[model samples]
Target chain A: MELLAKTRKLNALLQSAAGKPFREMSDTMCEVIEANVFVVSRRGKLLGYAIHQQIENERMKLAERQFPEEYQSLFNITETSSNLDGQGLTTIVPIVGGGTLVLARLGQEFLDDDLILAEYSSTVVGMEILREKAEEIEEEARSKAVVQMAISSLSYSELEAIEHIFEELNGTEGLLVASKIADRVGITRSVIVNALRKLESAGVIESRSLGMKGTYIKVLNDKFLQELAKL
Target chain B: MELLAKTRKLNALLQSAAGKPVNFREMSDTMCEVIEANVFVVSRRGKLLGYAIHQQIENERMKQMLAERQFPEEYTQSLFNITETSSNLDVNSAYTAFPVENRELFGQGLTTIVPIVGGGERLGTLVLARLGQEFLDDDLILAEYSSTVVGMEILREKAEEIEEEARSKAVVQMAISSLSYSELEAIEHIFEELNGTEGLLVASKIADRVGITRSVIVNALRKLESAGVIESRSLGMTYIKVLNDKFLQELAKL
Candidate 1:
């Protein structure tokens, strides 16, 4: 009956963490489960830890090596704290997306209830990571589609001019002279000026003149290079 | 434009197939028409289960090949390799492409393979090929979506069959039981109408459906309640529901 109540409490804590940031959720989970919790990334990067006394980096690395197979399995592992130079029972639960949640108690062993809580918490963490990765992939695909839409309206000459300007900038932010761009593209100054205007209005570049210096052009970084590469 | 129409049509067909038995001929035909390619379904063990060819000559060739229970060597080998290596098939929702080398059977085109998986089981695969063109990303996505729907439908059919068999056995056992005809009728009525119902069934409702008098129905329910075959809940009024589905399973076997 006590285990059932504890399970319910853990589930309530997990429910409250829904849509919350990973660090805050892990902290709450650690306090509720009465164990030190460390959230490790899929690649073994230490994302967050609830305990103030830091867990040794070497110890985490060793645990990672020993629990390499835990990521795919839904089971939890309980080992002696000496495996990480500590005292008590240590339970490692594999979170989804290759993350691991390690829980350790001091001077005592973990019960089946503790393992269940740790395993459930690990599942919650894994789902959050998978959700985050899915959102990232979706955002990338949307960005690419927007870039394609932006570039679809350009004429042959406009595309050529943008390519020439990108090549001249060479990934650096600097000034671009209209006369120099015209000479390089074998186009007249007026045509290059018109192409530059199109690019500027499209938000691909910014052009401004300082005193006698020809119009200074700075290519906006994010989508410009990606769209150009697609071209 | 045609591709969009084809995708929309395929989507409708797949949605309809969910929770229904999978008709391989129908699925293959719809896929072939949508993508303008020849379609084939191979079992997990690399045997040719079914195929649909859009072209006349290709259809004849496929017919001849199936008659001999033979598959083109390269296609069969590649499909077998895919089933063997694709343990994480559900993760990879996009179809993988393999070159079709047999000019006589498959001209020069890529054979795209999509795994059919559902409920964590690898059912089989769907293969598509066209002579002059390769499948676009959209086409591959559509094929994957179709295969997933087919897989779900197959699993649903299997589950339904098992459930129906169990219920049939239960019904047969109730037929030869010691209960009177009226009691058996009341039990059968509850099983049919109140199988998944949560609230207590009204006595009058059962009498109306079973065409028995309200007093008769109430007496029958009281007997069933006493026998523990049904249970009653008081909602300021008495209602009853079946408490067991396997009450007849043992008796039928005897």
Candidate 2:
């Protein structure tokens, strides 16, 4: 491979690092280098990795799901606590912000040209990590909006009542008494009827009053059963 | 300045492939251009997500790929076989390429497999095929780099799909939880008629089955489709299927 050709092609790709995620950045680097790449934090926790296409080992020694003992020894052997660095087939290139980029390969070692590619990409990956931290906060808010929409008309206790009321109805083989529902839910007959009325309005279920016998209820739209469980 | 022009030309291409509004076809195409080889992006389930070809490869294979939109069954099966027998390295070690044992069944040689992964998830694999030329170290590196972009596209699509399903699930939940007693009765009656039957749900026919008014069945069907409990497509006549898996299974007696 021509040094200029390889570097120029990859360098161009690495330059547009604005929206690319960490895994992409690592995978891109590891692909060019043909190795396993991981991001390790300042405290020596392994944040993530993109490995060889065909590799797996469940029994490898891991430090609380972090890196192995070999990686720890390599990671800690830095010039200073903050200025992290390492060498060998498994190498650590420091990220700009607060982590290390660890690249591991076998056979041929990381050449001068490969390290140039690895080191430049380390800074790029760091920026993405910081951006992701900020984005997570926004994403969490979006999830809450989805939850509110799912349980809009019902209060927390109403949802609790709705959950238990469904359980009571599910426990039976036949029809149910309004009074039995009221007693079982530990709420008034009025409360039980209100919840049932809501479902009736929503076309979720149909019910018939059988005078002193009981009420016959049939579920029409059962999708809400899965939704109710999620809530 | 010469290097800068090459840089921009390449960056523009990379941005198009890896940037917002992910497109997998463009991604595989970009990978093909980068390494000057044919590219096939296959999912973990062996579905063909994207494909890009060079002139040296066969038109017959592309036609089959266009038709099937999947990796050949035995070829994908062969991938499963190789991974099963291969021993894992101590941890964070290299993967040696295991050439496809049966060249007759699944073509290989100038073929390389690059796994696309994201956030510890095995998203897919990229298959690179150069006719007679072996991949240069540089070509392999560039191929791997592009796999990262392909993975992001996969992850991005999935995240959006999950969010969409959640919102749709909520809509279905709320829509059902507020129907009237008579409407529920109508729905129940319709379901009863639909119990043992499948394919091309026609409103008028369903109404006939349950003795409900056709308009009532039509209105209910519209509501169910809007809430995503079912979906419809018009091909001369409107055909519908229950989109809710739980309900579909119940109706199918699964």
Candidate 3:
């Protein structure tokens, strides 16, 4: 069978990246496709370069010259353009965790010949990588937030009821105020106010408004309190 | 402008059926379309009269002379064919389906059309029948089903929740079932752990740990009370009357 040259090359590149982190492997793959490949962090920092020293001799010098400013604005730019040399297409696809990697070929338009398929495949790969990274970031955030609230407190039942109530009133106003809090917690408003007063008196919680009914309930943070609060 | 010849005839017949039941008008439209237009109706019983009518004026006499069974058998077969088609169509569409009633008036060529779609395993269709130029493809028709049809099933569920909450005191039963068991357990554990001592303690614990709105918590408890799993004393302190021990045990198994 007469194998398509570009397809064989791409298969080899994808296989090479199989065992490594996407970030580490992406720049090398870019250099295989293009003479001057540059990897930029999501924040627009120029993380590194993999220039084909023989082919992009002059372009490599230009790339080095622009590295400083380009690195600073790496996060902002989106569109990539063609080079005057017309050697090959300059394809830039973003990697999953905070970086964009580019492939700048010299006299090698083999992949660009099938523009539609190349564009679609590139977009699909880029999207999958980015989504995996986004999930990691979100999981880390929820790890910090969801469990800490789940762990502190005395009785499981009361804490469960309070959390249920919290979820129920997730978007409502005046939640922390004593009267509103009492009305919400199904206890006498006086009980809620007294609870808030005691917490304030004990230095566990503080208040912003001194109305006959307290306006807001604030939980204080201490080393012990923080650790106790962590789920 | 060049108007469709059939459109003028259909309009006249439909106007005559104004203020009548839709079924009666529908029959009129079907008769005009099928019988008078002479389109196929899947019956072949009237061969003799058709031949006699072609030969001479003798078919009317032969029709008078032949046995009543032989004469109307063709018409009977045609009626049977129409009935079978209508029944099968209705079954396939799973909507109110039948021929436009008066095929003689409307013709087989002029009929209602609806689009069918599959949702999971079940198939459903949108119906459009006998609407005029005012019902022409327009923005109003497009918008009518755009939002409602896309999320019809989910909106139905939210409606049921709102209805149940209005009627009952124990809304927590619905809430517990609304989410998975782990979600319910996690939410419950957090709220209870936060508040230790007095009623005041419950509020502070909730604020400190759960980070949710307090009134929302109270309302949920009210729903729990209505469901008979919880209760309130004269001073309005809330407590679990029936903690649904079986449910908690099952959750533990998980």
Candidate 4:
């Protein structure tokens, strides 16, 4: 196939895989190009990789560290291919968001066509990663809303007891003895225990036992106090 | 000195200072009168941001020292040390006072330092120094309340500056133009109309609005996207989005 024609076909495939999981796209790239594909973060963290042929584990590790540096050096220029070891030709493409996409093949030097394919494919991977991050942020925001809702479900006295502990402790990470909380809130020890249990279940506080020193409670999320203030 | 009265006074002062520069002189004077103490505000980096001393120094040398309007280095260092060590400063907190013999021009009395913090960033410290009397429980509460208000004001000022910068960028971008100015303007109009709606605006719709041919609009959109000023995604068919409004706005003005 002509290099331009092959690149167009690969571009179409990658464009369609925009929101697909990164692993699936990487595996497809390896199969289509007959090369090893490794996706690594800017800090040299190995995110995922796929190999078309067997390579030694030690060689792979060494290549991972070395290729990221090459990616850094040649990033702003055109796609670069170089012979790093006897392991054949190594082609690296920098991904957006400070990640690198590296391709290696044995016995054959990487062609201009292969560089084009790797560059275009890495962009699609970057887009997919960005989409995943946006979704993750949305999920976290929803979870926080759910946590806030759970806090809103506590009783008045339970809320008061939680606020008292937060105020008395005032940024200290000490355990709140149930007796002390009961005395401060003018409630019974049993009432305090029940309130603490409710707060603990809602993820607002944690209850810990000190063995012979008796059980004590600590406020975990101070956000609940802000929610309580609104009520 | 009642809690309710002190809270009311601090709230009023904070409301007045909202979105304004930190008035060090006014805050110091107010705090001095309220707590019967001297007040100094030091930035988190240890710079003397602001200060005000009471007029009750009996020592003529100390009064002369106050007239210099210079904060003693050793005194400021002591206040900075308290901020670094304290876990948190809140209402009714104990005052960390300087030793009487170590008193300089400003440290003649007990001292309390309240950290002015907002938006998860420490803006600075508010130091309250009182002579003749120790800080009352009421004085501590008022100092903490005042610091909270000051922190809020600092955050408000920061937020306003960000908003102003964004608006200024948008305006500046609209004032410059390059080669593809018209197409950039067309794209900007679409984005302005969308007003944050999800999904893309069709190229034909933009073409009609901008009085250009569909082919010309498509060509320009591709150019804009390649230049990183806009982005195109296939929403069943090709649709365009303004990615860099500042860049587009600049071209549109040109």
TM-score of each: 0.37, 0.40, 0.25, 0.35
**lDDT (C-alpha, whole model) for all candidates:** 0.59, 0.59, 0.37, 0.58
Clashing pairs in 2: A28-B145, A32-B141, A200-B179, A201-B178, A201-B179, A201-B180, A202-B178, A202-B179, A203-B179
> In CAPRI terms, where does candidate 2 land?
incorrect
Highest DockQ among the candidates is held by which one?
4
lDDT of 4 at B21: 68
CA RMSD of each candidate after superposition:
25.0, 38.9, 31.7, 16.6
Ranking 2 against 4 by DockQ, winner: 4
Per-residue lDDT of A1-231 in model 4, one digit per residue for the tens?
667766666667666765646566777788767788887765666666777986765634534433434434534624444444564667777784426787887877665555667766777777666665545434433333434445444444554566676676666366565667676546566655676676678676788887746565565664455434433
* Stronger candidate by TM-score (1 vs 4): 1
Chain A TM-scores for all candidates read: 0.66, 0.52, 0.39, 0.58
Tens digits of per-residue lDDT for model 1, B1-254? 46678788887877676545557777888888876777777766656556777654434555666666456666555564565223222212333332223444443445567777654457677777666565677677677776776676665556555445434433333322334444545555654565553455665666676475666556666765665656777776566555655453322211
In candidate 2, stretches whose alpha carbon ends up further than 4 angstroms from where it belongs are: A1-231, B1-10, B17-21, B58-67, B72-74, B77-109, B195-254
The CA-based lDDT of model 4 is what?
Answer: 0.58
Superposed Cα deviation of residue B29, candidate 4 (Å) = 32
Per-model chain B TM-scores are: 0.53, 0.63, 0.23, 0.51
Model 3 lDDT tens row, A4-99: 665576666666655323444445444434355555555554545555644644534543423444333224334432332245446554452225
lDDT of 2 by residue, B137-179 (tens): 6666677667777777686777555445555545554444434
- DockQ order of candidates, best first? 4, 2, 3, 1
Clashes of 3: 52
